[PDB]
């Protein structure tokens, strides 16, 4: 989930697993 | 942004913790 290319759902696992409890804020440009 | 720079380059730990709330 980290140290790789995270594309389209596989960055919004990889910031569901690291931010835990904290959540995350998911914001295309 | 990250959705952007994240597809095209290797994402590290500090990246993505910076989007943790």
Redesign the interface.
Known sequence: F???????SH?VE??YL???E???????? | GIVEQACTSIASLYQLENYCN
């Open positions: 980290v140290n790789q290319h995270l594309c389209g960055l990889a910031l690291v931010c835990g904290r959540g995350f804020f998911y914001t295309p440009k």
